[PDB]
Amino acid sequence: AVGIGAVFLGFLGAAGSTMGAASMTLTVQARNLLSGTVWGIKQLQARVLAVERYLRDQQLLGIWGCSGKLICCTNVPWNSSWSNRNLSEIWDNMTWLQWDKEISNYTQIIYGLLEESQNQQEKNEQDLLALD
Amino acid sequence: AVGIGAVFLGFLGAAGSTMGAASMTLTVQARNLLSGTVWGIKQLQARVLAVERYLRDQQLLGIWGCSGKLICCTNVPWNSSWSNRNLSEIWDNMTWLQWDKEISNYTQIIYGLLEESQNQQEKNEQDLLALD
Amino acid sequence: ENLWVTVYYGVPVWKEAKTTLFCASDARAYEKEVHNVWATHACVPTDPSPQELVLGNVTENFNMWKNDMVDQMHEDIISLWDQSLKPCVKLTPLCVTLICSNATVKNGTVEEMKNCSFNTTTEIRDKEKKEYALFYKPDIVPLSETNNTSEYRLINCNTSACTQACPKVTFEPIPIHYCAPAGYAILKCNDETFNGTGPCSNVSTVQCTHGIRPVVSTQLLLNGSLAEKEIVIRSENLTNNAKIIIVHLHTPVEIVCTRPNNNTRKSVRIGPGQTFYATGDIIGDIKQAHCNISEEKWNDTLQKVGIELQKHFPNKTIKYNQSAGGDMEITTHSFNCGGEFFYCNTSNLFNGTYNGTYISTNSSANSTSTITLQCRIKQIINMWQGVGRCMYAPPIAGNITCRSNITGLLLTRDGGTNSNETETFRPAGGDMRDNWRSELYKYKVVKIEPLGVAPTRCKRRV
Amino acid sequence: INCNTSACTQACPKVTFEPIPIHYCAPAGYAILKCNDETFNGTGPCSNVST
Amino acid sequence: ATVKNGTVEEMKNCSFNTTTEIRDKEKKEYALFYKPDIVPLSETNNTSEYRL
Ligand SMILES: *[C@@H]1O[C@H](CO)[C@@H](O[C@@H]2O[C@H](CO)[C@@H](O[C@@H]3O[C@H](CO)[C@@H](O)[C@H](O)[C@@H]3O)[C@H](O)[C@H]2NC(C)=O)[C@H](O)[C@H]1NC(C)=O
Ligand SMILES: *[C@@H]1O[C@H](CO)[C@@H](O[C@@H]2O[C@H](CO)[C@@H](O[C@@H]3O[C@H](CO)[C@@H](O)[C@H](O)[C@@H]3O)[C@H](O)[C@H]2NC(C)=O)[C@H](O)[C@H]1NC(C)=O
Ligand SMILES: *[C@@H]1O[C@H](CO)[C@@H](O[C@@H]2O[C@H](CO)[C@@H](O)[C@H](O)[C@H]2NC(C)=O)[C@H](O)[C@H]1NC(C)=O
């Protein structure tokens, strides 16, 4: 159960488990994006590739307005054409590893939506805080 | 005195100075994490190692909920068994350089406490902002 | 009820991917010299902690023959052996007219070593002195078609220049652990009866792979992993016989080989400041090199293998047979032992049949019974093609022993004829990918995708 | 006095043996501490430390 | 050899003792060389000894 106490799930412990169980204790995956030391040129290349990847993820997440490394509720309304599926259909018995097979097609749309939708937000604070 | 005016204390100026004095003007230490250019393989190795350390500190500070790079009040309650010492015993004449000798034993406990505590925090906002 | 796109980070999602891997040694690999063993040089000390984790509800496809991990293992070992032979002396003054004597053994059961003599460029260059050394016959060829039976040439000097292996580097396989970089993980198939291609219904994950012995062997698979429960066989397409079959043993078969000849070393100067070690004397009586396998184990083992082979050829019974025939390095079982390279005629082993009829082991009337393979020695070696191929392995003084465990076979069926009820199998050594693929089958590298979007009842706070 | 022990090589004429001064610098995240005491013997607590 | 025209160049036919693949057993070998790639060896009167 998710009532673990002190976390001991390991790296990918919630793989195959419910979306809710994996949604709690997300830090065990986030914290482990690091490894290695160097021989020659190839292993140093593998080291810098991880930093490239981590900063790609961080920049893409931050442009959406997500400084937090776990969860965000976003302004973009849901387009129901993507699944037209119920909350229990998606949430209660699926896992993230099987959720990624469905909406990975539409990630390249949602990314642009979030990218613009942060700009329809923060420009307005640039006006209201001048009105204040 | 800490009433410096324009800051000129240098890199490690407050070493040996009071906790309060070192608590103001923390940026002079934080900002100095960039240097170098390359001869051979070992110098580029030394370059990337600094980025690795910087992202260690930044990530570990982030999962605790601290996007700010200077000071944080945190939701973890204080466990007083670690010192059972007074505020003046710790704050008024000690320096950070000799404070690190005491509670460095208990850092590996506080780190896990903060890590779980941010998850007790932000899961609730995922519910409250839905109730709103 | 309304839903909103909600984005999560730290999600447990991944996709299979291609990437480099680290190599990590056991803790005791760094008391030695540089480059000796290579495990000290290319690799990092491993930390067994954290240990394995089992994922409770996931199933994944594992494909052994499409695994790029062995394809990177091949490049790693190739570049790693190529690196070691840079500083060592690259011979070259030995490409001269060697004048050799006949010797006398008159039996044919044992070989002798040819006594050859040659004029040497001394360490002060232009003041030559004649010098002699013993050479194994496979490493020497007659120089010309002329009638002179007393002028010989090394097998080098026609194809490539060749280099001595240094004495401060050893051939013994230190176990190697392949570790993943950041952002990736290695999935371990925990199903103990997995055949090699299909969905593993019990998938674990580990920080690093378990130790691999990079033992080079052609026909048989020496010291390595053992099957958990039973003998399991692996092949891409058994209908087309040309594909190699990997047999994986559960019970090992013990093998011991020896060179009873008490060789003694000799030194020769090759230009300034460098030496070429050679064999100078054979103390005592010359005797035959061999390998001993217990018949009581092999006879049981090959019919145990027969029952497994019966399943995908149920129409026909089984017989075993000699290799396809060819050059020494192609046909014979070969291996390293203490620095020497052996090549064993294996016709005695692969003989007999099985018809679904098991023959008893109990009582073992003679546990001292053996079947003796006869093996030849070489010092000029073509260990891989294109690795800077030639290497001269120097002789090692004294007498040596080679005890080890057999843990699998590499085989290949002969073509069928007469629709026979008893079609046959042959041994087949070849590309060293097939050797490492016999042991890397448990693992697959994946790439963690922690960023995901989902619908949820919460919206942005303004 | 070669030819018995090792092969030898000439030093090029376009490279000089004169010691140019060398400064050792620290990488990022590290610092160098200079014992500013002018009578320090070599092993002990320096009561005046610079960086 | 003989061309005598000067409109076309020929190639000079040169021969040499080769350190063969077994080192110390030479054999004479010949090859054609373009004249710009060959120079006489010495100021002496020998018009039949050349160097690259
Ligand atoms: C392989 O061939 C070499 C020769 O190429 C053999 O070496 C020769 O061995 C003989 C017998 O020991 C030596 O002759 C003796 O030399 C001593 C010197 O004090 C002399 O007093 C004796 O009257 C006798 O002539 C000979 O010197 C030696 N050759 C050289 C160059 O040292 C070798 O024995 C052969 N080995 C085998 C296994 O066939
Ligand atoms: C360039 O010079 C070389 C010599 O340095 C010329 O090669 C020589 O050519 C002649 C004529 O073909 C060969 O002579 C013949 O040899 C055969 C051997 O069976 C013999 O039966 C004939 O009676 C005749 O003597 C000669 O062997 C050959 N030299 C060698 C070393 O093979 C070459 O022709 C010249 N090329 C040009 C374009 O000037
Ligand atoms: C050299 O040969 C001797 C004699 O054959 C070997 O000594 C035997 O080694 C076995 C182990 O394989 C022992 O069980 C025997 O007791 C030893 N003595 C005898 C008389 O057999 C010796 O091991 C060989 N050298 C090497 C390095 O293997």
Numbering used by the authors:
A (entry chain B), B (entry chain L): 512 to 547, 569 to 664
C (entry chain A): 32 to 139, 150 to 185, 185A, 185B, 186 to 309, 312 to 321, 321C, 322 to 354, ...
D (entry chain K): 194 to 244
E (entry chain F): 134 to 139, 150 to 185, 185A, 185B, 186 to 193
Recite the paper's sentences:
The HIV-1 Env is a trimer of gp120-gp41 heterodimers that are heavily shielded from the host immune systems by N-linked glycosylation and further protected from neutralization by conformational masking and considerable sequence variability. A glycosylated region near the base of the third variable loop (V3) of HIV-1 Env forms a supersite of vulnerability that is targeted by antibodies originating from diverse germline genes in multiple HIV-1 infected individuals. Here, we determine structures of antibodies in complex with HIV-1 Envelope for all observed members and ancestral states of the broadly neutralizing HIV-1 V3-glycan targeting DH270 antibody clonal B cell lineage. Here we used cryo-EM to visualize the interactions of a complete inferred DH270 clonal tree with the co-evolving virus Env.
